[PDB]
Design a protein around this nucleic acid. Structure first.
Lengths: 129, 178, 100, 232, 103, 91
RNA sequence: AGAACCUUACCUGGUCUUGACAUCCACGGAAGUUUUCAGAGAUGAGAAUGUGCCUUCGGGAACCGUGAGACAGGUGCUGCAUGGCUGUCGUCAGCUCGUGUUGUGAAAUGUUGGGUUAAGUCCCGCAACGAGCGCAACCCUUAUCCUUUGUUGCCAGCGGUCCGGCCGGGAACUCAAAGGAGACUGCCAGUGAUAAACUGGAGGAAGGUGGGGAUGACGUCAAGUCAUCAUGGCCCUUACGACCAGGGCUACACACGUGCUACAAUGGCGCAUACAAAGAGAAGCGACCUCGCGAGAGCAAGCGGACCUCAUAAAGUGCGUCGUAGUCCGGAUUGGAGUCUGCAACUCGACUCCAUGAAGUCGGAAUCGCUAGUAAUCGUGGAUCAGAAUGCCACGGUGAAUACGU
């Protein structure tokens, strides 16, 4: 069953699972502190931004489990994840951001290495002279 | 060639500064594909900028980006005899990007212990209009003002419109020349 | 392309498996550090001369059936061109291409 | 000019592959040699009429033959003794005991390989190739092909150098990953040297074969039938 | 943590035969248990090949080929001896191998 | 940069020729084609004629050559001088 | 696609010509194995296991020697002699199939105008008409989201409880692989010849055939492969063959194609710190163990692949350290040792490391890819693979400027 609201936050092929509840201004990520997972790096500023935009930097509590990233990017799945869950305090919060573009699933899909070529789109370099 | 309008990829505003102009800047600071090193390097640079002048975090950044900002480019359009190089107006998208690119191309000539100090010395300088890209702006506006003395197929064109029921032209155009 | 390079190669592979499988710790006893004044001698090189004419080190896992020099693929029993010919004709299970 | 064949990657997508077996990606060379040796030699044994496809299968401790015929009657030979001689040698090649079942009504005149044989046969005996190829097409689309493409080459006209010909009619699209695109290249000799004809046939976009399936599907058998795995 | 006490896996390089054979076992599992079973989509494998496309001259084109091996599982949240007994008679076999062992 | 492994590396093949020469310090130049092998005490005091890819070249073996191979003192390649065309010192 | 010998064409030297391997016949031998010794090894002598298959019980076959012929064998010549196959122009935007019409006709027309588009995409339209290839579509794959599964997958809550999905148990949840839901200038607005179509608006992950792959016309080019393989013309068949050994294309005169990694500070050095997806592993890989100086060693649980292992995933992140001094960047060469894969590391193989210690501070002509999961840059794994990666193939991480104009 449900007991917390839930966000999926899929951006850049990282997924932020985000369980939101009333509390104090507070983050735990993978049963570890912020100084540990995002210590002094630009990712620290990414995750606080959606709480600062909604001015609930002191009364939302969060629990964060994240798979399938890299360090700065997982913070970016968190940026979509916090607002994905927060649709169930206000459903029109998420509507107006979807109309501005500013919450959205990230706009790049997979592309493969191509047949006979040295990269995804780069062909075999040759002088031929 | 292009036969209809096609937009550009850009990402959303900054995670510290909440500005597009910051979001394009850290992007043009990018080295090895890594946006996550350039973010910290830009913010550590602006904090040094804040010790040089105690008025804002962006003080020398925003105004460098005002002073070294171009407006014009040169294109080549010539057939037959002699018509010379022909100037065009730059769109805002390229104004902003030429300025930030010139600010970091200039910045690298310095050797210090963090990239942040370097980039902070070129912004503080360009802010006072003694930067290295003051010259790059000046050269480009002098050349665009000079090369309007003659432009493409000018002599025959002055006949060609007037006989076609079409309006004034001087520039290559789809379906027929000027 | 020649039958003589196919004829050498085919006999080497059945005897590489015969002779070296039962002489795989002999390699440890005469080269590797598993000996330390123990044996290290002529009496076991009396036996490693059998896996020599026919041994993995002379069996380039190729040309045991087909007459194409290099690009062999030991998993099909074939080479570049004959993998492509059999795909064209559907004679391989599961053969498609990646589209992702 | 160019001549590419692109449809080599389609042949388990809305049509059957000529082989379906499992080898745990370690025994594939041993199983691919037995599957060839069984292809080459069974279609020579039923050489007394024609065949439209050959489909070879690996059950537990067994090798199982499927065949697509003009009829289950006079193709495989009268008496089941002739079909037991087929299991005798199929069993010998793979190294396990052998099965055979007979199937399918589909004529080999809708199919590639009897069409390519029939147009080389004219050319081998120097009768015709200007209209021999067009009657192939006529005879093919009247039994079910929405389109057929033919290329004939050889030493055509008795000429001391080589010539080409081609003919397309109906639709043969290759901007694809599906359809049945049923294909054969004949090779045969005549009193000038070697000749050959290339036949691409298009039966349908999801017709042609005994298949329509294109994947291993995961919502299968269970479209909206949900389980909770708990409290039930 | 719900798991199985005996492993059954189905492995094929042809995708259509294994999907049918799996479906016959899912019904066997539902006939020899208390819950609504279906396909476990365990990660399906692909081994990567590169070859020529002209026998000698020019290489700007080449070819890349795939062969896939499709993996199914066929287990209740905890299986029973009545499931393995019914399963093993009702399993299909013509181009898939079912292994009933662990390893 | 690199050197070889441990134990003897004599083999059966160098052994049977060498053994009839070692009792007598040497007898005759030993016709050798299996030039992949390392030198050893049993091979000191001898003269081993070492096939090169074309013919055997006689090697007098000494106490210094004992770390070295047999076909190493024997050529396999060609030479040109350092900025012109010139026929090779090496067969 | 992994060139020590093998491979491998080439070469030399041993050794033989129905021939080194098939079928067919004649004769002697069971084939196979193990083993001492001479010889480089082939080979030869001698030893030891076995006398099997079938049988006018002679003898033959399997396989080996040897011979007779058919015939095997040939990177043998020939690709203005071919079959099979494929590169180019190009994503050109055309090419062609059925057929009428205008000229005496070769041929045109269609296939060209206007609007729209990368496009012959599609609206309008003339004797050019209709339609297919190219290309649009179904396709596979992905994306929110709908959907099913429920392990080798997961845990908002609850339990055993060291508070670990290990396990009682649960389906809110990532989560994996798949049908795919969705998007059509259809909707609403502007434009545009009604219109196709472009652009704006909105809900939605997203408005512009959704992202991505597949994807390449008839066909000239005397294109190129006889060396996958087919094959005549046509030559050797004691050989333009073959068993066996060793060498070789990575020599060196110089230059040159291409890629890696680096020339630093965004970073390296050390130490510590964070989350992957993908996939392969029974003469293989593999925890722990004892052994070792890193490297590695044997012993061995384990391993079919979200079960164990490669794996500490790296880049990226933290601190202290380091600028123009070729260093605290880069660490090559080579001596030399320790180690590896292998009868065999020397020219031509992998890895650790000690001593000494260079080039390189962004490079002339030249020279290529890119519209976005791209470019770039990092690690990972596999095909190849005895032993060679920096290469190639695929996977996932972080992830950019701009597209006015022809």
């Amino acid at each position: 069953a449900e007991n917390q609201y839930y966000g999926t936050g899929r951006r850049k092929s990282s997924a932020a699972r985000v369980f939101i509840k009333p509390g104090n201004g507070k983050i735990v990520i993978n049963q570890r502190s912020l100084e540990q997972y995002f210590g002094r790096e630009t990712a620290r500023m990414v995750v606080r931004q959606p709480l600062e935009l909604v001015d609930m930097v002191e009364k939302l509590d969060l629990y964060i489990t994240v798979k399938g990233g890299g360090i700065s990017g997982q913070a970016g799945a968190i940026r979509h994840g916090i607002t994905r869950a927060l649709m169930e305090y206000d459903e029109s919060l998420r509507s107006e951001l979807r109309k501005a573009g500013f919450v959205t699933r990230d706009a790049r899909q997979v592309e493969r290495k191509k047949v006979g070529l040295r990269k995804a789109r780069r062909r075999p370099q040759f002088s031929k002279r | 060639p292009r036969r209809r309008v096609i937009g550009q990829r850009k990402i959303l505003p900054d995670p510290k500064f909440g500005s597009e102009l910051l979001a394009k800047f850290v992007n043009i600071l990018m080295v090895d594909g890594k946006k996550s090193t350039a973010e910290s390097i830009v913010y550590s640079a602006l904090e040094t900028l804040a010790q040089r002048s105690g008025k804002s975090e962006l003080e020398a950044f925003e105004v460098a980006l005002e002073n070294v900002r171009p407006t014009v480019e040169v294109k080549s359009r010539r057939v037959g005899g002699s018509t010379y190089q022909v100037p065009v107006e730059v769109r805002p998208v390229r104004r902003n990007a030429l300025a930030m690119r010139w600010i970091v191309e200039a910045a690298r000539k310095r050797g210090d212990k963090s990239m942040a100090l370097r980039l902070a010395n070129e912004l503080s300088d360009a802010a006072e209009n003694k930067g290295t890209a003051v010259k790059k702006r000046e050269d480009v506006h002098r050349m665009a003002e000079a090369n309007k003395a003659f432009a493409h197929y000018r002599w025959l064109s002055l006949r060609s419109f007037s006989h076609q029921a079409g309006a004034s032209s001087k520039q290559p155009a789809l379906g027929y020349l000027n | 392309a020649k039958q003589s390079m196919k004829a050498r190669e085919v006999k080497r592979v059945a005897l590489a498996d015969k002779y070296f499988a039962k002489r795989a710790e002999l390699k440890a006893i005469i080269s590797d550090v598993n000996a330390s004044d123990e044996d290290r001698w002529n009496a076991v090189l009396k036996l490693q001369t059998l896996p020599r004419d026919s041994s993995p080190s002379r069996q380039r896992n190729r040309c045991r059936q087909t007459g194409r020099p290099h690009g062999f693929l030991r998993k099909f029993g074939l080479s570049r061109i004959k993998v492509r010919e059999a795909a064209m004709r559907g004679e391989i299970p599961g053969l498609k291409k990646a589209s992702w | 000019g160019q001549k590419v064949h692109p449809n080599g990657i389609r042949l388990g997508i809305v049509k059957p592959w000529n082989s379906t077996w499992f080898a745990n990606t370690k025994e594939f060379a041993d199983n691919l040699d037995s599957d060839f040796k069984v292809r080459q030699y069974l279609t020579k044994e039923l050489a007394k009429a024609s065949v439209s496809r050959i489909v070879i299968e690996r059950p537990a401790k067994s090798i199982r033959v499927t065949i697509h015929t003009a009829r289950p009657g006079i193709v495989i030979g009268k008496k089941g003794e002739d079909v037991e001689k087929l299991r005798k040698v199929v069993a010998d090649i793979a190294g396990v005991p052998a099965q055979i079942n007979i199937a399918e009504v589909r004529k080999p005149e809708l199919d590639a390989k009897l069409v390519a044989d029939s147009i080389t046969s004219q050319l081998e005996r120097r009768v015709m190739f200007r209209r021999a190829m067009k009657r192939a097409v006529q005879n093919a689309m009247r039994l079910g092909a929405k389109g057929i493409k033919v290329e004939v080459s050889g030493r055509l006209g008795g000429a001391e150098i080589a010539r080409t010909e081609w003919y397309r009619e109906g639709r043969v699209p290759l901007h694809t990953l599906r359809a049945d695109i049923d294909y054969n290249t004949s090779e045969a000799h005549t009193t000038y040297g070697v000749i050959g004809v290339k036949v691409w046939i298009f039966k349908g976009e999801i017709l042609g074969g005994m298949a329509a399936v294109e994947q291993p599907e995961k919502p299968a058998a269970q479209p909206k039938k949900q389980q909770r795995k708990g409290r039930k | 943590m719900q798991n199985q006490r005996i492993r059954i896996r189905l492995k094929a390089f042809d995708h259509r035969l294994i999907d049918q054979a799996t479906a016959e076992i899912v019904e066997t599992a539902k006939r020899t248990g208390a819950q609504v079973r279906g396909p476990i989509p365990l990660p399906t494998r692909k081994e990567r090949f590169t070859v020529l496309i002209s026998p000698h001259v020019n290489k700007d084109a080449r070819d890349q080929y795939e062969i896939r091996t499709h993996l199914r599982l066929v287990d209740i949240v905890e299986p029973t001896e009545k499931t393995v007994d019914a399963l093993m008679r009702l399993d299909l076999a013509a181009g898939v191998d079912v292994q009933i062992s662990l390893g | 940069p690199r050197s070889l492994k441990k134990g003897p590396f004599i083999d059966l093949h160098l052994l049977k020729k060498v053994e009839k020469a070692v009792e007598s310090g040497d007898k005759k130049p030993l016709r050798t084609w299996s030039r992949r092998s390392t030198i050893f005490p049993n091979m000191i005091g001898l003269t081993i004629a070492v096939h090169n890819g074309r013919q055997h070249v006689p090697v007098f073996v000494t106490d210094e050559m004992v770390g070295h191979k047999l076909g190493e003192f024997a050529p396999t390649r060609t030479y040109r001088g350092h900025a012109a065309d010139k026929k090779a010192k090496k067969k």
